[PDB]
Amino acid sequence: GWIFGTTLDSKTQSLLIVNNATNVVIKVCEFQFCNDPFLDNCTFEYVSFKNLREFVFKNIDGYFKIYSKHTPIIVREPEDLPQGFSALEPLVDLPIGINITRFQTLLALH
Amino acid sequence: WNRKRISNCVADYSVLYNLAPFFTFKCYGVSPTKLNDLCFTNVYADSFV
Amino acid sequence: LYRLFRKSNLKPFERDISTEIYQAGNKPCNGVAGFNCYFPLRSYSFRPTY
Ligand SMILES: *[C@@H]1O[C@H](CO)[C@@H](O[C@@H]2O[C@H](CO)[C@@H](O[C@@H]3O[C@H](CO)[C@@H](O)[C@H](O)[C@@H]3O)[C@H](O)[C@H]2NC(C)=O)[C@H](O)[C@H]1NC(C)=O
Ligand SMILES: *[C@@H]1O[C@H](CO)[C@@H](O[C@@H]2O[C@H](CO)[C@@H](O)[C@H](O)[C@H]2NC(C)=O)[C@H](O)[C@H]1NC(C)=O
Ligand SMILES: *[C@@H]1O[C@H](CO)[C@@H](O[C@@H]2O[C@H](CO)[C@@H](O)[C@H](O)[C@H]2NC(C)=O)[C@H](O)[C@H]1NC(C)=O
C-alpha cells in the first residue's frame, strides 16, 4: 500500500491505503507510521516476476482518483519496462479532501 | 477628542508590528494582518491615555 | 470555532484541522501564544441580543 500526506509527522491529515489480501483499508487517521510495516481524528474510512501492476494516482478538487491495470508479463532483461500499450481503467474515486505533497510505499517483510 | 482626518496616504502599520514599544493590535471590520493593502478616503486617528 | 488566520488560500473541498499557532511575525512562536502569534480558531459568541 501507500501513505500520502504533507509532513507525515502526526500533526496533520494523512491518507493510508493498505491491502491485506482480503480487504482494502483506506483511512485518513493521523497516527504514527514508524518506518516500515511488517507481517508474518479519523474523518474517513473505507473498507473494500510474472505480475505487473500499474496505477495512476491524482488528487484534484478534493478527490483522489486511482486508475489501475493488472497484467502478466514475461521479461528477458532484469527489471525493464515492457514496450507496449495498455490502457488503465478507472478503479476508485475518494472524497477525502486533502492535499498531498509527499508519499511513500509500503513493503511486506518476514 | 482630536479627530485627525488623515487622507491621501497608504497605511503602513507593519513598522509597529516590527517594533518593541507597540504591544496590542486589534482590528474589527478588517483583518489585523491585512491592514497594509487597504485604502481609505479619511482615516480618523485618535490618541488618548 | 471559526478560522481567522491561515497561511494561504485553500483549494476547493479541503480540510484544515491543524491547531498550530499562525506565524504572523518573524519570531517563532514555538507553542507560545501572544501578540504576533495569533491562534487560528476564534468564536464570535452568538447571542440572542445580537
Ligand atoms: C480529535 O479532534 C479534537 C478536536 O477536533 C482534538 O482536540 C482535543 O479534543 C479533546 C476532546 O474534546 C479535548 O479534550 C477536552 O475537551 C473539552 C471540550 O469538550 C475540554 O473542556 C477539556 O478541558 C479537554 O480539553 C482536547 O482539549 C482537544 N485538544 C488537544 C490539544 O488535545 C483531538 O486531539 C483529536 N484527536 C485525535 C486522536 O486526532
Ligand atoms: C498543501 O499542503 C501544504 C502543507 O505542507 C501547504 O503548505 C505548503 O508546504 C510546502 C512544504 O513545506 C511548502 O513548500 C509550500 O510553500 C507551502 N505552501 C505555501 C502556499 O506556502 C500548502 O499551502 C497546501 N496547499 C494549499 C493550496 O493549501
Ligand atoms: C484485513 O483487514 C480487515 C480490516 O482491517 C479485516 O476486517 C475485519 O473484519 C471483521 C469481520 O467482522 C471485523 O470484525 C474486524 O473489525 C475487521 N478488522 C478491522 C481492523 O476493522 C480482515 O479480517 C483482514 N484480513 C486478514 C486476512 O487479516
Closest-CA distance, C6 to chain A, in angstroms, reads: 14
- Ligand 1: centre distance to CA C3 (Å): 17
Beta strands in B1-49 (DSSP E): 4-7, 42-45
User: What is d(CA A107, CA A5) in angstroms, rounded to the nearest whole number?
Assistant: 18
CB atoms within 10 A of CB B33: 17
Q: What is the atom index within ligand 3 of the atom nearest the CA of A22?
A: 25
User: What is d(CA B33, CA B16) in angstroms, rounded to the nearest whole number?
Assistant: 12
User: What is d(CA C42, CA A7) in angstroms, rounded to the nearest whole number?
Assistant: 25
Could you give the angle at the alpha carbon of A85 between the alpha carbons of A84 and A86, nearest 5°? 125
User: What is d(CA B13, CA B34) in angstroms, rounded to the nearest whole number?
Assistant: 10
Does B touch C (3+ CB pairs < 8 Å)?
Answer: yes
Residue B40 makes CB contacts below 8 A (sequence gap 6+) with B11
| Contact yes or no for B33 and C24 at CB 8 A | yes
Residue A44 makes CB contacts below 8 A (sequence gap 6+) with A26, A27, A28, A94, A95, A96, A97
CA distances for B16 relative to A57, B21, B44, angstroms: 47, 8, 18
Q: For residue C44, what is the nearest residue in chain B, using CA coordinates?
A: B28
Residue listed under C-alpha cell 483583518? B31
Phi, psi of A8 (to 5 degrees): 60, 35
Number of residues written out for chain C: 50
Question: A80: number of CA atoms within 13 Å, CB side?
Answer: 7
Query: Which secondary-structure segment (H or E) carries A66?
Result: strand A63-72
Could you give the angle at the alpha carbon of A48 between the alpha carbons of A45 and A52, nearest 5°? 115
Pocket test for ligand 3, best of A22, A38, A48 (most atoms within 8 A of CB): A22
Number of residues written out for chain A: 110
Residue listed under C-alpha cell 509527522? A9
> Resolution of the deposited coordinates, in angstroms?
3.4
CB atoms within 10 A of CB C38: 19
Could you give the angle at the alpha carbon of A57 between the alpha carbons of A51 and A60, nearest 5°? 165
Residue listed under C-alpha cell 491621501? B8
Q: How was this structure determined?
A: cryo-EM
